[PDB]
Structures are given as structure tokens and as C-alpha cells.
Design a protein around this nucleic acid. Structure first.
Lengths: 53, 47, 260
DNA sequence: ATGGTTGGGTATAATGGGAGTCGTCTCGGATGCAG
DNA sequence: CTGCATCCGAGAGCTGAGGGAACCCAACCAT
């Protein structure tokens, strides 16, 4: 987040837009408390049988 | 029996939706006014 | 990028094939590595399989994830052994490397065999993987002393693995292997009877053609248990709005009248 | 104590697959062109 | 270094009704 905030001071508009786009995701993860590694599955949930009869 | 019908409850289709969202590894949780969990499954799915 | 079959074919084709000298050399190496494994087991007095696992882990390297601590302790528990009776360990390492090479070189025979088993409920890649399992078993059991080519012994194991996987995994409701063979024999007999009669045979004719211990009722039961379930999502009608499961009522939960 | 089920085995030689689909429209990343 | 400019891919197009391919051999848990 600090690196992207520093990058957001570039005179270039495209660079600033890219840094803002990355910052959106970074700040969403920081605010929610979710860990990014949870986007990789280790255990796969299995739906109850009565909903897949 | 001649009385008036009672107040409704949570439809089963919403429970099906919650279970299908859990199968996609998404944690959907119902909360009350104080942001505490509300169990809509009547303690039948809690270990 | 996509089409994993092409990617797998490319990765297998990047490995060159073998000549007679190389194949016999590798097979002899594997055999002496197993003998060295057993000799080292006798020397140390420990279980042979666990030392085999330590050799395999050391060859495969850190890249492949029994834990590092244990295998390290036994690794230095073996380096302590003096010369002349230490060669065995090096021969075991070499033999395990030879086993890996042999499997890598003979992977293409698995594809060649498995390409004629499509359309039996298993995808091509699953058949290839089960053939690879059979190839590993054949590599372990191969005896080069008989002067036979490796593929001659490997084909039998590859076919056995593919057939066993097909019998085990092709059906949603698992049917035992002997019953699957019975179903296949019944279907082939019915097809031959139809070819001879020029029409669909009756169950009594099939029962007569199977042999002793077969009547029409048993054929009926066998055809009954050989029925595969249909999908709840089978589209009914031309428009994409009606599924089969939309026409199936729930008979378990009590009705409002029943509850009242 | 019986059948049903399951694991193991076969030794001439075998060595890179196969179906398919070309009569739709609109909008937001992105690689490529210029300045 | 920036910008715009085609380029590719991804996600849509009303409701209601009715519609349905080997074989064999031997040990071993379950019932």
C-alpha cells in the first residue's frame, strides 16, 4: 500500500490509474481482513446430498 | 382450526442459496443489529 | 496453452526413446539397485522399504516435498558405514535414477496403448494416467535376465491397469469387477445372438447362450442393475427452460395435510 | 459356513490424438501505432 | 515517455401455458 501510494504521485496518468487499480484490491483485502492466500483452495467444500439428490 | 395464519419464516430457497454459496468457498453469514451472527438453520448444521 | 493433451504429448516427446543397449543397461541397473537395497537393509538391520524411501527422497531432491529430519538422520546413519560395504548405497541411488529414466523413456508406449480405449466412460488423460501406473508396476516387476524386450512385459500391465480403472470408475454407482465382466459378456453374447438371428434376441435365448446357471430372470436382473442413472438436468422441450428434475415431486417431507 | 468381493497376474513386439465450425451485438482491458 | 485506436473476449437478448468392447485364480471380510 505504501509503495502504491508513492507510485500514485507520478505525472503519468496511466501509471496513476494502474496504481489506483492495484490499490483498490489491496485496500479491499486490508479492510475486510481476508487473507489473499485464501483465494487458493486447500479443502474443497462438498454440498449437502439433499441439494444434489 | 379456525385461527388466523401465523407470521412467516425464512424460505427454504434462501437456505439452499446459502448452502450453494458455501459450496463455492464463500462465507455468507446473517447478522443482527449488533453485527453478531444469527443462525438461520436452527442449530442443525453447527458442530 | 489450452488442450492439455497436446501439452502432455509435447512433454513426452521432449524425452528421446531408448536403444537396446540403453534399455538393458537401465533394467540391469534397476535390478542391482534393488539387490543393493536389500543388502544394505541386511547390513543395517532395518526395514528395506524405508531405506528405499530415503533413497527415493534423496534422488527426487528438496524440490519434491517421512520428513526431512528423519530422512536426514538416517542419511547420516548410513554415511557412517565403512568402505567396501558402502558401494551398495551408491548402487541403490544409481538404480533409483535408472528407474526414473526408464519410466520417463517408456511413457510413450502408455499413450500408444491407451489411445484405443476412448469412449468407455473415461477421458483420454485418465486412461493415460492409469496406464502410467501400470507402467510403473511393470518397471518394478520387469526381469531383463529373460532377454525379452521391455514393452512385451509392459503392455500386459498397462492393459490390466487401464481395464481395472475402467471397471472401477466408469459408473456413478460402483459395480464390482466380476459383475462388470458379467455385464460385458452378456452384452457381447446378445450382440452375437442378434447378428445370428437378424433381430433383437429375447432373454431366454440369451440365457441359453450364456450357459449353465443362467435363466431369463437372471438376465433381467443383470440388465436391471446395469442401468445407468439419468441427469436431473436433462433438457425437456426445445426451449432452454425445462429440466427433468422440475417434474420430480418430493415424497419424504410430510405434506401440510399430513402434518395437520 | 457360504458367496460376494477384491487384489494379483499373464513375458515375440508393440513407443505423440481427434473432432470440428465457421448467418449476433455491445462494452471494457489491452497491445500496437504514432507523436 | 504519453496518448488514442482498433482488437479480443466476455456476457446478453419479455412473461405465461405445455413439454419427458479380456480372462483367470486365489485369499478375505460380510452377512
Amino acid at each position: 500500500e505504501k509503495e502504491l501510494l508513492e507510485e500514485m504521485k507520478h505525472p503519468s496518468r496511466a501509471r496513476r490509474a494502474k496504481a489506483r487499480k492495484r490499490l483498490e484490491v489491496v485496500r479491499a483485502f486490508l479492510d475486510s481482513g481476508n487473507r489473499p492466500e485464501w483465494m487458493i483452495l486447500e479443502a474443497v467444500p462438498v454440498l449437502p446430498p439433499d441439494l444434489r439428490p | 382450526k379456525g385461527e388466523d395464519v401465523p407470521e412467516p419464516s425464512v424460505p427454504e430457497s434462501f437456505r439452499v442459496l446459502v448452502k450453494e454459496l458455501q459450496a463455492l468457498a464463500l462465507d455468507v453469514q446473517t447478522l443482527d443489529e449488533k453485527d453478531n451472527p444469527v443462525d438461520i438453520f436452527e442449530g442443525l448444521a453447527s458442530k | 496453452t489450452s488442450d492439455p493433451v497436446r501439452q502432455y504429448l509435447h512433454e513426452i516427446g521432449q524425452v528421446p526413446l531408448l536403444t537396446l543397449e540403453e534399455e538393458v543397461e537401465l533394467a540391469r541397473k534397476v535390478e542391482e539397485g534393488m539387490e543393493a537395497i536389500k543388502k544394505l537393509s541386511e547390513i543395517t538391520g532395518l526395514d528395506p522399504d524405508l531405506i528405499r524411501e530415503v533413497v527415493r527422497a534423496k534422488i527426487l531432491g528438496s524440490a519434491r516435498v517421512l520428513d526431512p529430519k528423519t530422512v536426514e538422520e538416517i542419511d547420516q546413519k548410513l554415511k557412517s558405514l565403512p568402505k567396501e560395504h558402502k558401494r551398495y548405497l551408491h548402487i541403490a541411488r544409481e538404480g533409483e535414477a535408472a528407474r526414473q529414466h526408464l519410466i520417463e523413456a517408456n511413457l510413450r508406449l502408455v499413450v500408444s496403448i491407451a489411445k484405443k480405449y476412448t469412449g468407455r466412460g473415461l477421458s483420454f488423460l485418465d486412461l493415460i494416467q492409469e496406464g502410467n501406473q501400470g507402467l510403473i508396476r511393470a518397471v518394478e516387476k520387469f526381469e531383463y535376465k529373460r532377454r525379452f524386450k521391455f514393452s512385451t512385459y509392459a503392455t500386459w500391465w498397462i492393459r490390466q491397469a487401464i481395464n481395472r480403472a475402467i471397471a472401477d470408475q466408469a459408473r456413478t454407482i460402483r459395480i464390482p469387477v466380476h459383475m462388470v465382466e458379467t455385464i460385458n459378456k452378456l452384452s457381447r453374447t446378445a450382440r452375437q445372438l442378434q447378428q445370428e438371428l437378424g433381430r433383437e434376441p429375447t432373454y431366454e435365448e440369451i440365457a441359453e447362450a450364456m450357459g449353465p446357471g443362467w435363466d431369463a430372470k437372471r438376465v433381467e436382473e443383470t440388465l436391471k442393475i446395469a442401468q445407468e442413472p439419468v441427469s436431473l438436468e436433462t433438457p425437456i422441450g426445445d426451449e432452454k427452460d425445462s429440466f427433468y428434475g422440475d417434474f420430480i415431486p418430493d415424497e419424504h417431507l410430510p405434506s401440510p395435510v399430513d402434518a395437520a
